Structures are given as C-alpha cells and as structure tokens.
A = this chain, B = another copy of it.
Amino acid sequence: ASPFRLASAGEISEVQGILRTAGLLGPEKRIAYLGVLDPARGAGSEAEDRRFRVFIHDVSGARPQEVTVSVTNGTVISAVELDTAATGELPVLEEEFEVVEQLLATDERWLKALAARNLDVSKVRVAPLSAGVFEYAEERGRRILRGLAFVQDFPEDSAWAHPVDGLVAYVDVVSKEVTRVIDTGVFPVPAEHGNYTDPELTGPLRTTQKPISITQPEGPSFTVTGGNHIEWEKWSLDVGFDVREGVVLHNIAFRDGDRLRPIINRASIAEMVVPYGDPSPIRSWQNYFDTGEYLVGQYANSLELGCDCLGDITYLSPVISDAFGNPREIRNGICMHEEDWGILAKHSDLWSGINYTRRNRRMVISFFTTIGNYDYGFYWYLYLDGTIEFEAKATGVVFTSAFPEGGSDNISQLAPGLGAPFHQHIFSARLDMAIDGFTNRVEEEDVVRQTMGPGNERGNAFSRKRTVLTRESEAVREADARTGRTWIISNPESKNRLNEPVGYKLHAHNQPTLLADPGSSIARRAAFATKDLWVTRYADDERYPTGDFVNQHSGGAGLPSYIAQDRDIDGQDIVVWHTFGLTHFPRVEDWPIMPVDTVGFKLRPEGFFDRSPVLDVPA
C-alpha cells in the first residue's frame, strides 16, 4: 500500500517511458531533476496515485519544461514551458561539471592568463561554480557557470592547495561560449602540497588506537517494513529520499499507549547556502546553494561499513534518475542504526533507599554528500524521551585563495601564501508540523526577569511569557539567546491531563544568521537566511525557502513571497522554517583536510505527554 515508499527503479523507468511516449523526452532532452511528489492532504482514503515531478533541460537551446507525471496511470498530468529569465534556471547538470574547464582550455584569454603565471593548461582544474545574479545583463536567460582555477601537479594531487588567484572566467554552457575572462593580476600560486595521504605530510601513522567493537548480537531494535517504514521504541516514520533535499522524514509519530500520535508530517533540509565574505571581485559573487543549485541528494556517498557508519547498520539504497531518465542506485546511501546515548534518568533517593538508573538510546538516520571541496553529513536523531534532533557535520577541504601580502580582514592564512576566505554554511529546516494532528500554532517564549518590590520582596522571582504568532506577517522571528528564546508548536484543540495544550519546544543554537549587507544580491536570494524562524500556512507548492528554481534567479520567490499572503496560522496547518548555520573563519587546523564541525537544532516535548514517556524502559 505504502504511498510514502521510496521510488523504485521501475517507477523511474516508467516515468521515462511515459515522457517518451508523450513526446517530451527525445534525444536532445536531459532530466535536471526528478522526484516523487508527496500524497495530497486527505488522500489516505483514496487509492494510490504515485506522481513524479521532472525538470527537463534541452541541449539544443530550447526552453526547459516542468512536468508532472502519474506513474500509476501512465499519463502526463501537466507540462509547462519555463521562461528561465523570469523564474530561474534549472539546477546544475552533472554533465556540465567538465564543460567549464574544457571550453576554457582553448580560449586565448584564458591561455594568456595561464601563460603569464607559467602554468601548464593540462594541469589546471576549473571548478564549475554557480553564477548568481549580478551586474552582467547578457547573463539574463542564459545558463552560465563561473570558473575558478586550481593547479593539480599530478593526478593524485589535491588541487585545493594551489589556487590561482586574480583570475576568474564566465562561461555559457549551452552555446558553449566563454563570455568573460577577468584577470586582475598575478598572485603567487601557493606551492606546498596538501596531500593528506602522503607519508611525508602525515608522518608515521599512529599505532596507539586499539579497536572499539560495537555489536548487537540479537540484531537491532528497529524494524523496517515496506522498504522504508521504521518502527523503533514507540516511534513510527517513513524515510524518504529526494535528489534535491536528500533524506526526508515523513509521518513522524509516537505510540503513546494505544494511540499513534503525529508530531511532524514532514521534516527536511529544504535549502543550504554557503555565502562568501571576501570582497575580492574574484570571489565576491560566490554563494553556493548546495541544495537548490547542485542537488545534495544526487551526490550522496556510498557509505562503507566500519568506516562511515559503525555498529549494526541497516542500509537503504535510494534510486535516482540519470540525465536520460534511466534509474541509478546509490548503493548504501542511507545509514540507519540505533546507538547508546548515556544515562537517560538517574536518582539515588535519601529517604526511599531506591537507587535507579536507566540508559538512553537514539535512532540515527543519516547520509553524507560531496559538493566539490565540501562534504556534509546530515543526521536525524529520535530519542527515547521524545526528543527529535538534526545535526549537520561539515568537513572536506576548505575553499582556498591566495593569502594577500600584508594580510586580510576577510581571509585566513592556512599555509605560506595560502588563504581561506571567510564564509558561512546556512541551512533551512522545513518542518511541516502535525502536533497531535494538523491544527497547530506557534508561540515565541521568552524568559521574563522581575523587579524586586511588592510581590517579589527578595528579588528572586523569574517567569516567562508566550506570544502567539497569529498571522504570517507576525511570524518572521529572530533569536534572543540572552532571554532564552524558544518557539513552541502546540495543538490548541488537544490537551494533556493537566488541561494544558500539548506541544513541542524548538531549541535553537542561536548562531549568527546571514551577515551580508541587507542590500546585497545574496540577502535577496537567500532572504530566509536573514532570520532564525519563519512560520507559514501550509501550501503544496511552497516547498523551498528559495523557490523551485534558485540557479541564477533573483528575488521574487520563496519565503518572502509566501509570507506576503498573510494567512491565518493560529490553529491551522502550518510549517516552521528554521535557519541555522556555521560561521567559518578557517583555522590552520582546518588544513589540509578539515576536522568535522557541527550545527543543528532539536525539539523536545513540552506537555505533550501526561508524564515522562520513559517509565517503562527496563533496567
């Protein structure tokens, strides 16, 4: 039955077949995105209709299309020609990755720039970098990538150690033309290698680590049915996968006694952006929307046992479409396991004589992706006590530049002559809430300090206040760590045994939000990133905080447009969008490969249950 099951090879093949039969997938067409759509609200009672959404690119220069297909019924539901100058370009295609370097290698301007620096063109790697929207009128409606160069001394060399600063190129990847080559002057190309598997750099490998063995002799405590339905320690959910968003959780619910109680209808990382803070014209345009522009799911790693995921691991192997509509498996792309999480609850009582200790555990659902130099792990955690948590783990190799003679206010030094421009990695978690069902509301809760005086003669009292966000125009909120600000999602029509509305409290890390000037291109294209919390009324076409087409798309779409509708969110079907990020001033310790750093958020039950939900956990 499972309408939330993962896409199968057969379903993608059938989408291909339906598109072909309908005249929409001839030899010049390429699929830039393909994913299954979620069931409509209230569709459970009706029969399944598995629908897929497809963005089709045309290599001959014709306009791209957005298409929705019914794989159940073998039909095309809708097909619409896109005007990309207006609504945005399609996501970067796998196959364009090589094109920037290939075109530049026979361009006379590019070759002149390389010859000035005594660089062999065969050794020069060029990254295919998203272009954004700046002052170049000719780029409007054209698929552009920008190119930054890095020297690779030999095939196994880390080119990131050898950035070619002072040089950037712009390329039309459809007409296959180089539009601009900018050379602001030569900088020394940093000479030290950054080869972290070279014994010369690592030194002798440590022989001091003794093994750690994590086993489950009776297997894991979770079950998987229907391919992707998880049941674990009162929790129930479906693990989806999408080529854009990556791992998506559906139908997060908790079995409280005899009742399956919904909590979150859909949880995803709906966008992530990496804005750079270096004003050099060589990099001042760079803002990588890894999710919206590159599609993080499509570059999910195959994860190796005992290396990437340790313990008793159950894998999912999601299937995606290649550029022609053939199915492609990402073998062992999703890890699922439970792990011990220390003490859950403990008390040694002075009067009863009873000593009591219980252990915690969490269910982990993760994937790891690679976008150029960056590698990111996306981890969702469900805990015994009802807590839900997301954690992003950032690693890879830092994006480099030259380090200016005389230093920099916007770049860190990593090695002689080698710099790393300052940047942020900013995520948007889209939480389609369903606290005990769909009738929800959000309150902002602040700690309230009280003045010494009447009613508080010793000046010890403190309190809190809650402010209901009633309409979307009032629902764009900022952090206030000093006042312990959190946000509670509750169901005003579902009360606990103490007659208080059931709820969940979102605890943010209160890291800095987008630092760019509010008048910048990135502040408009990533408006979501300027505020910590947004609440919208649910709509099926409001999927991403940046809109459907982010690549080379100005403001116009996404959260600021959604919120303008000023819809009722006080006891309605709502969606929370939480912005959270890492602000990275690279350190020498990040070079030549960066140790993991983390950011995330959690939600904890807040009067959702009638007492602790973990009293039945055994010793």
Contacts and interface: CB of A to CB of B under 8 A. Distances in A.
Contact of A463 (B277, B353, B510, B588): B277
Nearest to A455: B279
Interface in A170-227: 196-197, 201-221
B213 A216 contact: yes
B375 A462 contact: no
Interface stretch (A21-29, A82-90, A302-310): A302-310
B484 A347 contact: no
A447 B385 contact: no
B385 A595 contact: yes
A343 B459 contact: no
B206 A616 contact: yes
A161 to B, nearest CB: 11
A578 to B, nearest CB: 15
A481 B511 contact: yes
A522 B452 CA distance: 12
A232 B258 CA distance: 49
A345 B385 CA distance: 30
Contacts of A523: 459
Chain A: interface size category: 35 or more
Interface in A526-551: none
A209 B216 CA distance: 11
A368 interface: yes
A356 interface: yes
Contacts of A414: 498
Contacts of A155: 352-353
Contact of A352 (B159, B307, B340): B159
B484 A482 contact: no
A612 B585 contact: no
Nearest to A125: B351
A43 interface: no
B612 A595 contact: yes
Interface stretch (A6-14, A51-59, A389-397, A563-571): A389-397
Interface stretch (A265-273, A315-323, A325-333, A603-611): A603-611
A193 B360 CA distance: 24
A375 B611 CA distance: 19
A152 interface: yes
Contact of A596 (B218, B360, B618): B360
Given A216-B211, A607-B587, A370 B345 contact: no
A464 interface: yes
Nearest to A502: B588
A348 B275 CA distance: 22
Counting chain B CB atoms within 10 Å of each CB, the highest count among A219, A342, A410 belongs to A342
B357 A304 contact: yes
Given A212-B214, A344-B596, A360-B595, 18 more contacts: A209-B617, A209-B618, A213-B213, A213-B214, A213-B217, A277-B460, A279-B455, A308-B346, A308-B357, A345-B595, A385-B589, A386-B589, A479-B481, A481-B511, A589-B605, A589-B606, A589-B613, A593-B615
17 contacts: A152-B351, A156-B352, A158-B349, A204-B616, A205-B618, A207-B618, A214-B214, A278-B460, A279-B457, A287-B460, A409-B463, A415-B611, A449-B517, A450-B517, A452-B519, A462-B515, A484-B512
